[PDB]
């Protein structure tokens, strides 16, 4: 599975990084944890800190849209991000 990132705008009004990238996966659309693990090494973002909102794969060609995000605080994520995103994004040791 392969990833290339294009847009990394940082919102000054919240102190978070907007991660936009193209998922050049092969065959099976990768899960959110796997895409987070791959996207972490591209910009030095921990799993608890790096957050992804969608890995949306298109028809036909094995290319997907990844709208990931980065925060300088997990409490900031819990204050801003929705609870379904926090559940959907597995924390270190999460259940």
């Amino acid at each position: 599975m392969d990833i290339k990132i294009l847009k990394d705008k940082n919102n000054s009004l919240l102190n978070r990084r907007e991660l936009d990238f193209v998922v050049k996966y092969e065959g099976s659309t990768p899960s959110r944890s796997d895409v987070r693990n791959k996207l972490a090494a591209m910009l030095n973002a921990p799993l608890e800190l790096l957050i992804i909102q969608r890995i949306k794969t298109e028809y036909g060609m094995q290319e997907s849209k990844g709208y990931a995000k980065v925060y300088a605080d997990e409490a900031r994520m819990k204050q801003v991000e929705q609870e379904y995103i926090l559940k959907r994004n597995p924390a270190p040791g999460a259940e």
Partner: protein, 234 residues
């Protein structure tokens, strides 16, 4: 106090997508016809917050200012020539009406800049005051030098007078309606044509024409005193 997707105003540039209501603007100081929500502005034009909840959060946390006033409500109206200031990037934007009568935003350079208003009805508050029918900011309750339609300029956020931009024959003028919106040009003849409706005005910039006095803004002496046009960012 609702408004629907289809019956969105003609001055609202945002499309007709979604599900019925699109962010009902308050009563506010400005007219509802030439007004956009600050939530809709920050969620469509600038793209600093995508959700309505996150927009309400960022507004409520004192992060966006409208002429130095950090409004916490996402339904605040915006009129023409309004300045939005964001200190964290030094992003300055001005409400402008393009050639189709719609409201857009032009980016400015400096964070600190004046705002332009206009005179609409000079009344007399009791106490020897010449009330100018002000609607926003602070001002000066002045004298008979301040006539109707004089298009005063005032600082931000203290809103003190910078320069009385009184109109005469030949002075600059910006259109605020019709098919000539945004075609700023010099005044040619401001004729006080007596009639039951309202008077008229002659203006010619790039091309000459006749325009109505309620569709003219006295926006400068000979050149733009305010930062009229910067960068048209969607």
């Amino acid at each position: 106090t609702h408004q629907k997707r289809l019956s969105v105003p003609k001055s609202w540039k945002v499309g007709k997508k979604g599900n019925k209501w699109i962010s009902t603007t308050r009563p506010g100081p400005h007219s509802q016809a030439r007004s956009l929500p600050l939530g809709i502005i920050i969620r469509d034009i600038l793209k600093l917050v995508d959700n309505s909840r996150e927009g309400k959060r960022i507004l409520s946390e004192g992060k966006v200012l409208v002429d130095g006033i950090p409004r916490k409500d996402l339904r605040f109206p915006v009129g023409l020539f309004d300045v939005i200031t964001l200190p964290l990037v030094n992003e300055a934007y001005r409400m402008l009406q393009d050639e189709k009568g719609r409201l857009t935003l032009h980016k400015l350079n400096e964070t600190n800049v004046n705002k332009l208003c206009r005179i609409n009805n000079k009344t007399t508050v009791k106490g020897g005051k010449f009330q100018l029918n002000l609607n926003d900011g602070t001002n000066i309750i002045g004298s008979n030098e301040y006539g109707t339609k004089d298009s005063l300029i005032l600082s931000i956020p203290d809103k003190q007078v910078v320069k009385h931009l009184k109109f005469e024959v030949g002075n600059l003028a910006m259109v605020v309606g019709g098919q000539h919106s945004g075609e700023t040009g010099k005044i040619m003849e401001i004729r006080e044509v007596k009639s039951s409706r309202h008077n008229t005005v002659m203006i010619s910039g790039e091309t000459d024409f006749e325009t109505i006095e309620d569709y003219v803004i006295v926006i400068g002496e000979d050149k733009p005193e305010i930062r009229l046009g910067g960068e048209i960012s969607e």
